Enzyme design. Structure first.
Site, PDB file in Angstrom:
ATOM      1  CE  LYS A 137       6.691 -15.605  11.618  1.00 25.32           C
ATOM      2  NZ  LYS A 137       8.088 -15.899  11.205  1.00 25.32           N
TER       3      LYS A 137
ATOM      4  CB  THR B  28       8.929 -12.444  10.823  1.00 21.68           C
ATOM      5  OG1 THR B  28       9.516 -13.734  10.608  1.00 21.68           O
ATOM      6  CG2 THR B  28       9.532 -11.432   9.867  1.00 21.68           C
TER       7      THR B  28
ATOM      8  NE  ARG C  42     -26.747 -10.005 -17.552  1.00 16.83           N
ATOM      9  CZ  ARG C  42     -25.604  -9.329 -17.633  1.00 16.83           C
ATOM     10  NH1 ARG C  42     -24.748  -9.529 -18.625  1.00 16.83           N
ATOM     11  NH2 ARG C  42     -25.292  -8.428 -16.704  1.00 16.83           N
TER      12      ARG C  42
ATOM     13  CD  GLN D  37     -20.555  -2.269 -16.039  1.00 23.75           C
ATOM     14  OE1 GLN D  37     -21.402  -3.156 -15.956  1.00 23.75           O
ATOM     15  NE2 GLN D  37     -19.595  -2.296 -16.944  1.00 23.75           N
TER      16      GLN D  37
ATOM     17  CG  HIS E 275     -19.651 -14.581 -18.370  1.00 20.63           C
ATOM     18  ND1 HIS E 275     -20.320 -13.375 -18.350  1.00 20.63           N
ATOM     19  CD2 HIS E 275     -18.334 -14.274 -18.451  1.00 20.63           C
ATOM     20  CE1 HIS E 275     -19.431 -12.389 -18.423  1.00 20.63           C
ATOM     21  NE2 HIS E 275     -18.221 -12.910 -18.489  1.00 20.63           N
TER      22      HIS E 275
HETATM   23  O1  LIG Z   1     -19.865  -8.716 -22.086  1.00 17.25           O
HETATM   24  C1  LIG Z   1     -20.237  -8.089 -21.080  1.00 17.25           C
HETATM   25  N1  LIG Z   1     -21.343  -8.504 -20.345  1.00 17.25           N
HETATM   26  C2  LIG Z   1     -21.482  -7.704 -19.282  1.00 17.25           C
HETATM   27  N2  LIG Z   1     -22.482  -7.589 -18.435  1.00 17.25           N
HETATM   28  C3  LIG Z   1     -22.434  -6.491 -17.614  1.00 17.25           C
HETATM   29  O2  LIG Z   1     -23.257  -6.362 -16.702  1.00 17.25           O
HETATM   30  N3  LIG Z   1     -21.491  -5.476 -17.788  1.00 17.25           N
HETATM   31  C4  LIG Z   1     -20.442  -5.498 -18.665  1.00 17.25           C
HETATM   32  O3  LIG Z   1     -19.721  -4.529 -18.868  1.00 17.25           O
HETATM   33  C5  LIG Z   1     -20.249  -6.863 -19.284  1.00 17.25           C
HETATM   34  O4  LIG Z   1     -19.448  -7.396 -18.115  1.00 17.25           O
HETATM   35  O5  LIG Z   1     -19.079  -8.813 -18.197  1.00 17.25           O
HETATM   36  N4  LIG Z   1     -19.609  -7.015 -20.543  1.00 17.25           N
HETATM   37  O1  LIG Z   2      12.018 -14.541  12.612  1.00 20.70           O
HETATM   38  C1  LIG Z   2      12.587 -14.086  11.607  1.00 20.70           C
HETATM   39  N1  LIG Z   2      13.475 -14.865  10.871  1.00 20.70           N
HETATM   40  C2  LIG Z   2      13.888 -14.166   9.809  1.00 20.70           C
HETATM   41  N2  LIG Z   2      14.865 -14.411   8.961  1.00 20.70           N
HETATM   42  C3  LIG Z   2      15.207 -13.366   8.141  1.00 20.70           C
HETATM   43  O2  LIG Z   2      16.023 -13.536   7.229  1.00 20.70           O
HETATM   44  N3  LIG Z   2      14.684 -12.083   8.315  1.00 20.70           N
HETATM   45  C4  LIG Z   2      13.695 -11.734   9.192  1.00 20.70           C
HETATM   46  O3  LIG Z   2      13.363 -10.573   9.395  1.00 20.70           O
HETATM   47  C5  LIG Z   2      13.032 -12.943   9.810  1.00 20.70           C
HETATM   48  O4  LIG Z   2      12.095 -13.158   8.642  1.00 20.70           O
HETATM   49  O5  LIG Z   2      11.249 -14.353   8.723  1.00 20.70           O
HETATM   50  N4  LIG Z   2      12.379 -12.859  11.070  1.00 20.70           N
END
Ligand SMILES: O=C1N=C2NC(=O)NC(=O)[C@]2(OO)N1
Ligand SMILES: O=C1N=C2NC(=O)NC(=O)[C@]2(OO)N1
Ligand SMILES: O=C1N=C2NC(=O)NC(=O)[C@]2(OO)N1
Ligand SMILES: O=C1N=C2NC(=O)NC(=O)[C@]2(OO)N1
Lengths: 295, 295, 295, 295
Positions: free
Chosen positions: A10, A57, A176, A228, A256
């Site tokens: 779930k 589930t 920047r 980096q 940016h």
């Molecule tokens: O065009 C870039 N400008 C950046 N600035 C940066 O800090 N690192 C990059 O590798 C970069 O990341 O967006 N490449």
């Molecule tokens: O409560 C459940 N109802 C379901 N229906 C289903 O097809 N399988 C499950 O295992 C189930 O998946 O949601 N568990």
């Protein structure tokens, strides 16, 4: 044909929990979105219409709410470990539980300078997350992160000395704007089980706080040579401050902000030292990633 | 057939501006999204392919950036008034300019307890907006708002005594969660022109601050009988604190958090006084509106 | 202070309905999102904590589902009229009901060239909407629309002869891309009540189909002088084809696709007659509106 | 500390291309969003402020547009292979290029039953994607997918025989709604380089068409025992129809539509055989995954 991989469960389970201190009247709220996906001896549900192996589930959803009722939901690393452990212990044939938690901010309001006992504000869309993989016979693997932390600095960012060839139009710059949405992940040493996770509980909030503090201070203070170079400094500092982390990963868009030449209009000067009005660019964006570990 | 209404212009214009104090080194940033739509003697562009009456939307975009270069962008009420006035003064045949501005948050970072001179955080997706309608011969009509202010209180909200008939299943409650996204608008007295707007400039930031303060304190402190009753109190207080406002409007979703009955599982008690874990509901949602004026 | 305006109700109510022909086996599905907001003698809920006048939004939700169970949900104009009429008839003190319906597409699948009896595809995010305002003593006012109809033509769009002054940089063009998201609304003659709405039922689907057909054909075939000129032609044609419409409104973004000069790279020619690769611009965008009525 | 992983480049690059047949007048349009991330001997950009190793992301953007000008953009598998190959060939120190392409739908309009030469509709938000990883010395790894294909069937879906224990509330059913958003990925045999990719070019469009056809027909025709069982049938059929595929992966949300018991209101019957009006649930949702390969 054969099933090479399968998991199911779930997703998008919204969960709120309140804690009420009846003595003081102070209430504290937690809100999450949870996903639990299971693996195990489930292939026949796919190949043979064998539903006997499926923990529905819907039942996984119920279990999330029951587990939140019966346990702390914080730190999320702990809650996710409890939840994942439950599935592999309860169901013999389930051998992994993959728990993702997104924690939403509900920060206590200050009203007339005093913290309010039961009122909260979504003070940022920044999230705190975990990915907890509980794998039978292989312990508990936890990745913690912060994401959606959106920042901008208006100077003390540079980008020069990059490769220049016949594909290059970008001007070098010594001043920047730099803006990004921080996604930072720290990967914990494998834990053997829930006892070991519990033994380190205070470290989870502390390491999140460290990661956030280091990110903000390094961003603010580094006269940046590049995304980096700045992000590497963040990662190395976080590693130095928590030995139970193995790696730190950053994924950073370069959002940016372009200068706007207005000199065609009455000689208006809005570039270089005179740049005041900029065009934020929605797309495209640089995307810069790295994972740092110890040497 | 005939043109009964027409307006056109440029939407979604992202604008950043920086102010740099060269003496102190403190930089301050502003970021907006702007829309300008014009009305006037433009019907022949629609009916006769007469483009001579069209100030190109591209030119409207250029004008937004030029106006931001040559004027303060804050408060947004002022910037929008300057921008709208420009179109009706520059172009004889343009008789209204409709200026919408969404202001994005860039809050100065505190690093080691000190405000940083050039680093900022998007501390909330909450917006401050204006809608400035400059209509030739009819002055300047300004609606100011805050929106996207997301709040929750965990108790001190009630809802009982509502109409009950054959369509009603909702249980009365004396203790529930209340959460909303606040959209609050204050409508100013008509201003005769840009001089009158300028004469009230400090009131714009002050009234925004008042509206925000009142919203938060009333939400936090009102032991709420309903969204209706609480929001009315907010509006009446804001009206009492600024005589140049004519009306205050609130639009509030009731973002429901449902109890989860877990008594089917081992008798677990999670309702009423024992309610700790709730299911936030994404939809549907109550939506409650009102506009308050003076008697 | 006093309440100058108020309305409240339930928003974002998702509704599915199926019709099953047991004779043929053919099933047909409908999915909507519904909002109902009420007005009336409700001011004391705001001013005096008087909840007795509030039909709970939860009850409004229940009523939407009950009404969908007991009535056709198509055409949406009819369903919205039934739903709005219910509130003003059932509750003496409620004097207006404002019903918005967004209809989602579930188009029947063709499998091996044959329509499938019970399988459907969301073939577009285009919506069909209504806004039905049922106002006691003032009949039923219906605005019908299509929205989210996203189109592009790669030539046979022009834009020249627009005003040129010191704010203008845009080059005239005789051959450009035009792309938009169509939002088209037709406003019906006031209906006296539900009998009159019912008496015109076939006209609702027919007029929607006309509006869509005219929009697509005019967009495709008009060698466009401007968005203004093209959209006017659409509106006048729709008015000519349904006398029970009073006005047609279009709201059209001009979703710009910019040429990319590549001549800096090995003399590559990618502008004018040689333009093949373009940069779609996410923002900003022109926004062009008009409402056309009869002379 | 040391760099364990790094990649960087330009994301969210929107690209349009037109092809014009001057003989026939037929124009054909392509629109994508492209991401290119590079790996190689770039660690010193992170550790030592060495920008000499950085091919600027701005230059990567330029290169995307140049490559689209000089080459076909379809099939996306080919375009991505050309683009990735360029970086590893042009730059000695770059050893991998990771190319993601999302293809947006522009389907030719039929006007009065005839295909229009230059007008298009976004007939679905469904995407066709590729992930092309060009790794020096290790060929070209291609994953192709369709995503955002949203479907619903109103009957011929079942779910019974699942595990029942103290966490289970879900009722078995023999007749329910099934709706999902299909994300289906086919992973190609490794290709040695661009010649081998080119040698299989027709297979890319053909296999996409097969995958889509099989998905739709199996969804429509399978009287489904579970999402698991139905999706497995889709995967095995696709594998049987293209030997150059190694695996097929599906990721399927179970987008729940809940019955609404209305029996509290005048005994209205809206469950089981009488179920006509349902509540679509936005969240949570089941999420069911598997990867199928050959035995
Ligand atoms: O065009 C870039 N400008 C950046 N600035 C940066 O800090 N690192 C990059 O590798 C970069 O990341 O967006 N490449
Ligand atoms: O409560 C459940 N109802 C379901 N229906 C289903 O097809 N399988 C499950 O295992 C189930 O998946 O949601 N568990
Ligand atoms: O069911 C309801 N519950 C509500 N709570 C409320 O404060 N007012 C309402 O009118 C209500 O709004 O959502 N209707
Ligand atoms: O720059 C402009 N280009 C345009 N094209 C157009 O059709 N009409 C305009 O008014 C215009 O709308 O975007 N303004």
């Amino acid at each position: 044909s054969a099933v090479k991989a399968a998991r199911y469960g779930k997703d998008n389970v919204r969960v709120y929990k309140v804690h009420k201190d009846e003595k003081t009247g102070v209430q504290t709220v937690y809100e999450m979105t949870v996903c639990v996906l299971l693996e195990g001896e489930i292939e026949t549900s796919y190949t043979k219409a064998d539903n006997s192996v499926i923990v529905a589930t819907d039942s996984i959803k119920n279990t999330i709410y029951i587990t939140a009722k019966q346990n702390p939901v914080t730190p999320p690393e702990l809650f996710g470990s409890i939840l994942g452990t439950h599935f592999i212990e309860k169901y013999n044939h389930i051998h992994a539980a993959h728990v993702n938690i997104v924690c939403h901010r509900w920060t206590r309001m200050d009203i007339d300078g005093k913290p309010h006992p039961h009122s909260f504000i979504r003070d940022s869309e920044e999230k705190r997350n975990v990915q907890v993989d509980v794998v039978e016979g292989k312990g508990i693997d936890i990745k913690s992160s912060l994401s959606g932390l959106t920042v901008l600095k208006s100077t003390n960012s540079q980008f020069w000395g990059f490769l220049r060839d016949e594909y290059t139009t970008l001007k070098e710059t010594w001043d920047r704007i730099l803006s990004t949405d921080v996604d930072a992940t720290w990967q914990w040493k494998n834990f053997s089980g829930l006892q070991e996770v519990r033994s380190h509980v205070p470290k989870f909030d502390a390491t999140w706080a460290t990661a956030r503090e280091v990110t903000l201070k390094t961003f603010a203070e580094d006269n940046s040579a590049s995304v980096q170079a700045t992000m590497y400094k963040m990662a190395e500092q976080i590693l130095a401050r928590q030995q139970l982390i193995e790696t730190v990963e950053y994924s950073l868009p370069n959002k940016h902000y372009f200068e706007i030449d207005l000199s065609w209009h009455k000689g208006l000067q809005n570039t270089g030292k005179n740049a005041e009005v900029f065009a934020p660019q929605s797309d495209p964006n640089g995307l810069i990633k790295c994972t740092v570990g110890r040497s």
